[PDB]
Amino acid sequence: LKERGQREVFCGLTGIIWLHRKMQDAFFLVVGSRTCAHLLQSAAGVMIFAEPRFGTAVLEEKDLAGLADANAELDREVDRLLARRPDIRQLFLVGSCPSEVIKLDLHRAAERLSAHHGPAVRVYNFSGSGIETTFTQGEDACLASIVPTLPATEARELLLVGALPDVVEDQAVSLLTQLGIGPVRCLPAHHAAEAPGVGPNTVFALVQPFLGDTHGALTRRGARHIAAPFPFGEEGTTLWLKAIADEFGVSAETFEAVTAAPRARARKAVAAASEGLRGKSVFFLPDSQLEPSLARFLTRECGMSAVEVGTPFLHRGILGPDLDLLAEGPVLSEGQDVERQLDRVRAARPDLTVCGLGLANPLEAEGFTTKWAIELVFTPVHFYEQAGDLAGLFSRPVRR
Amino acid sequence: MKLTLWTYEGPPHVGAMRVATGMTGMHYVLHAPQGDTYADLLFTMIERRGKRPPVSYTTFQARDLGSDTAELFQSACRDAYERFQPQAIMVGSSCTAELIQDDTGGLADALSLPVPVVHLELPSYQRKENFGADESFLQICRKLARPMERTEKVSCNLLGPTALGFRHRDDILEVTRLLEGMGIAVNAVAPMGASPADIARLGAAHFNVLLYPETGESAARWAEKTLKQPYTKTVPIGVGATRDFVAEVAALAGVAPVADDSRLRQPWWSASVDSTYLTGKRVFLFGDATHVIAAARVARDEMGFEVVGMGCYNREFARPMRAAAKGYGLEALVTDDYLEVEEAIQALAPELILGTQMERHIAKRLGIPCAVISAPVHVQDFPARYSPQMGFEGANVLFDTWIHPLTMGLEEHLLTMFREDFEF
Amino acid sequence: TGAKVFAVYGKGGIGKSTTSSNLSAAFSILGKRVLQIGCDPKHDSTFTLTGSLVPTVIDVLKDVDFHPEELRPEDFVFEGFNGVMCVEAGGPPAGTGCGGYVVGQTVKLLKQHHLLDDTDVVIFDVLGDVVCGGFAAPLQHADQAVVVTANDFDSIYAMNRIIAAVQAKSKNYKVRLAGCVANRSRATDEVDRFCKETNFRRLAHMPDLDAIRRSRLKKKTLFEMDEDQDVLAARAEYIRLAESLWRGLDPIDPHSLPDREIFEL
Amino acid sequence: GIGKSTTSSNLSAAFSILGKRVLQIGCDPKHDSTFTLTGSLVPTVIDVLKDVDFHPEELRPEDFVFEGFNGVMCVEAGGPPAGTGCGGYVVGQTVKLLKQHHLLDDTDVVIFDVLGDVVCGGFAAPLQHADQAVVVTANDFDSIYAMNRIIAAVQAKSKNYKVRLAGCVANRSRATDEVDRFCKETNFRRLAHMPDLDAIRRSRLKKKTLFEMDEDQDVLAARAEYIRLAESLWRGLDPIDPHSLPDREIFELLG
């Protein structure tokens, strides 16, 4: 739904920036052209300067006018890199726009590399091109790549399917064990040691909103989805914890006792950040798909009137839980071309104008106080203890 | 195929985008995949250019991989004409549409837009952004700049400055000050502040001036024949280069070589007794070819630094680079990866390495004093403060920026020396 | 394209080199910007134009790591008489591979450095003696394919060979055989009649073998620097050639005659 | 370039007389080099490909051997049928393919007299077989440069075949002395082979060459020279120290 227009979202490879942070024993070999190489170089920023696992093998002209030579050469370069990087145990080949158009057999390449490399390096392939994906969707694809490989466990386990920082995922696990049993197995494994036992009865806890196809891939293994509004505020977090609890079985008393300290911990912080957001117009442009959750939280807690919650990729079975808390007032429009929502912003002037980084500076110069959603994925604001920090981040009431 | 981690240069369409964003009112419409708009971030943040860069990517997806891409481009051009009303418009493709041939120029002609359209042929797999920029500039000069009457006053065009360029914005101001000081009036700076009207007026000058040969040599060479316009070779970075440049444009125009150097403090501030530890320090210059060559002419001739290394990443400019490397007794490192230069400085261990952002970062990783002189930079290196790199004030800027790492090093060395001795 | 991309084909060392150079000087006299490309591996095509041997593109190209970017104009392209740009392609020194890889690289070089944009006349002095993928490698970019031949039936057989080759290449291109040019041969009665059976246009020439003594009169071509009596008639002939090519003439189309039909006497 | 009519016959007709009759498969797609030993141009040369897109009757059982005056019984070759193909179809795949298509097993001796315009810069199997005859050159600045290229080839074909070489005849169109100094620089041989009344009298050359027309070597005695070159004495020696020169030194003459 771009009306044949400029969809500002990034190609899925930008998700690799934080994925490599999550799975610290995983390398990501991207076969993109110099454009995709420049994208990784830029969007990663300071990542490049500390030996990042961001192989951006550029396919040059010799890789053109030839197919078997290309993936044979790819095999060669991979072997070279594990020679330089023996520590890596899972290599993440990723499909790029150049890789898609030249019809590179990324799956077959990953297969032969795994075969000659063995279980010591379980090289995996997925797709993160802009021809198919859009920013965060890359993380979806990357975790979906490991989903079939993960050990099959028919026992009732919980899956922490999300790349939240340690100071977030550890807190989530601690709370869940505090009220529930917590057979929590984080799907984005910190190391290959913590291989999660995905299975039929291993119901998976979805915690990052942008994860769409993830749902499908995990449900193929039988892993069911909890209809829990996304843990991103006094409503999303509380509802998510509640639903996760009753899914495994937790008394209301135990839930209240466990979440009593976090509840008061975050209520004061969110209020102390909300007065900068008290009664103003918002506008979510389709950058990264957290906007529905952000509207579910901020509109109802900090009193930010919801004008339009744009979304590049709308979902019905995943977004529904937090969709229920969403008011009908905001326009649920999907991700249009930049001109459309830009003109909407100009017409219905919003106080806060959350959008992509590319429009952030112009609309900032165009009299729109802007907060870029790009900051959201890196800054650890996806649980109870950081709900106030999220509100402070959204606040941004800079005066001159 | 080669595993790249930090490409010194973006793809060439980034260079064309730099030229388009530099000048006013020329919409560089693109046949690019959905997501390739990442380049807009560079101009909107690192250059902090307010308005969105005047570029309209078609942003095609899995839905669009056939003739629908051609229809996308058709729309993109007609839209861009009406919505983003230009006086001149570019066409071209990124890597994806380079492979999925769509006859960009043919599409543009199919619209037959009243404003001139500049067909851009940009090989996006064997060349880089410096090329891309030079090629784009050349194509728009041959499409818009036609020979015309010389301005009655002696006048010159600065060619080379380009949006998202290392202190280009300040350097135009400095060179303009110097040229007016001699008496030469600047006819039209292109392509950093020019307009298609200005590119039309290009021919009216008496002689082009090459500030940045990387983005301007092709334009100047074409102007030499089409517009009968000589172009000066000596980029004026540093005191000595400034003197040569002053004399050169003086000869070219016909005006006396008087240039006001009352703001020159570097000859005095480096000849001072304070700057005596700087003599015979080892330096590793890396980065843009012209910047590196002039920085070497400063380091070995006005500062007393001993050049122990030298290297470049502009393969296009390897020949003058190698010539200068012989000039200083060294061997030029005409490479394009950080591994080679990293190994080079590790073997060399110069006191003050300086160059691209990578040079600074792997200086820090190696704990070596670090400065910045070349093109690839981040938002910090793009300053708000007036910091040209050419002219006399450019010489002073070079001085301070280069010895700041040295002063930091000396002061920290002292502080560790002091308050610290054998316990017993 | 953006210029009259001529192709001087036909046989080796008999006219084609001298014909190409003197035609270049003719178009220089006409004033149109001229480009002579010495694709012939003798590295001798432009010698008369510059008065000196030119370092071939292959030489400088190998002087760098086969990187065209390092090279620049005025390093591999050299000027000649009447300000005519002229390049040379150095045929491979038996490096197997492709025998026209160098001429293809020269085309790439000129197009890259925009030498092949402003110029109006481009006469590809390509070796016409042999028929191999590489000799017709720049024939693609060609638009009028001028063939030069002598009265000798060996030269005429070669001429027929050229027709066959260029018809095969033009089966996929709009390049036209501009006309069979005799090369200082004397009586063209045979040549004109052979052209008649092929229906080919027998472009007129200057018959004398000694308008130049040799080496184009010590590198000084007829138009370049020459004031002999027969030089004047030849100069008129070559101006006739130049105007004929520049205006454009009938789309003559020779049918490839079998060798037996060619006078085998 | 040279017609080689004055050579392909008047080198080894006395050899064909001496040993087994030569087959004389000299590359001349103009039908102008080998035919002089035969009675005429004989354009047929079994150019018809009787086998479907293959050499007739696979290995043709010596069904061509056009007879000649001085025990020729040979065949001729030369044709540009394919035309197109860079290193794979025309000069890359010569229509003759291997010479083994013709019964070398039965016609052991063969005379190669290729034109020598450094053809087939790709395919490098032909123009180098046999041990009796090699590329014949002549006397002309372009000719000397071209046969210098032929040298550079055979030096690059040193590992190829048996590098038979043994020298080459510099067909002396006239008394030019440049060939002598040039060969001295290349440490080669030039001797003497004058073509006269051969290209202009071809009505008589078509059937019998100069050493057998009316005994035209009666005033142009050069067959004893060939009895030194060909036949009994063979000029084996060394391969007359071939040494190809690059472009600048092949410009030893004003050229």
Ligand code: PMR
């Ligand atoms: C692809 C272009 C681009 C550039 C220029 C970078 C680096 C950088 N991006 Mg933002 N960034 C781009 C995109 C993205 N950035 C990324 C990273 C990053 C962060 C965490 C931050 C940011 C920002 C910037 C900036 C300006 C501030 C900075 O250098 O940190 C650069 C050059 C900066 C910000 O948005 O404003 C304060 C900030 O704190 N980006 C990510 C998220 C994975 C992507 C997709």
Ligand code: SF4
């Ligand atoms: S056809 Fe020509 S270019 Fe191709 S390999 Fe043979 S000689 Fe070389």
Ligand SMILES: [Cu+2]
């Ligand atoms: Cu500091």
